[PDB]
């Protein structure tokens, strides 16, 4: 997908 | 005074989480981007689907309009940016040069330059006409969450997971300013105020801060929302009352009075994290967009 829609841990 | 935004339309069609929504400067259109690799164009006033723009090999984290509403730029996990002619749907340029995902992008007010931020911890400045990289700024030591030009394009503001907000001279590339407050939370968003005198920044400690960039001083704080994981856009709402608008990880849109920092409204109806909001340039219209469990865009209209 996309990094923004995955977020930061 | 308090706004009275109400839901008018819900826009379905993205098959994966929505990443960003932006109104065109002429106020005719809404552009959305998604993890599904697609840009979608919708009517800003009715929400009627206009068209789909494709070509990225991986998901898109950001999309942004040119000043004349003719061009889009998209930033994707395929490590490229793409410049698109909206009317014809053509990819006019593919900006290669980042070595990791591209997270954020914007045009300058002239729209002869594009700024990009990447997981490779750099900020890049690209020439719109040729698609060639003009400058690579070693901006940060962690992924860059946002980039934005000021009103005349002489200044670029960037934010990063490293907790820093930095101001760069577009022409020269030197770091003019580094901004950080008492703690070191990751900075998930930043943007200049419409007059260019302030920058609004989001940190992953449930906080929005309005900064006077010249004095290096935090002027306002906005709290009460949930922001700890996601790079959520925030906006200045100026068509009616002067508000600060932001999505939230509790699935609501939050609207604060800019001066009093009071929450004046919460918009309910999304079923996942509200990752993105945008404000229409002439009408009191908010567009909001949410993550994988929701996949929709919502338009809200108010009287002030």
Residue numbers in the entry:
A (entry chain D): 40 to 48
B (entry chain B): 31 to 334
Copy text from the publication.
pmcWDR5, a well-established core scaffolding protein found in histone methyltransferase complexes MLL1-4 and SET1A/B, was initially characterized as an epigenetic histone “writer” to recognize histone H3 lysine 4 (H3K4) and is essential for H3K4 di- and tri-methylation (H3K4me2 and H3K4me3) to activate gene transcription. Two separate and non-overlapping sites located on opposite surfaces of WDR5 mediate most of its interactions with binding partners: an arginine-bearing cavity located on the surface known as the WDR5-interacting (WIN) site, and a shallow cleft on the opposite side referred to as the WDR5-binding (WBM) site.
Taken together, these data collectively indicated that both MBD3C Phe47 and the residues connecting MBD3C Arg43 and Phe47 are crucial for its interaction with the WDR5 B site. Indeed, consistent with our prediction, the structures confirmed that the residues at positions +1 ∼ +3 play important roles in the distinct conformation of phenylalanine inserted into the WDR5 B pocket.
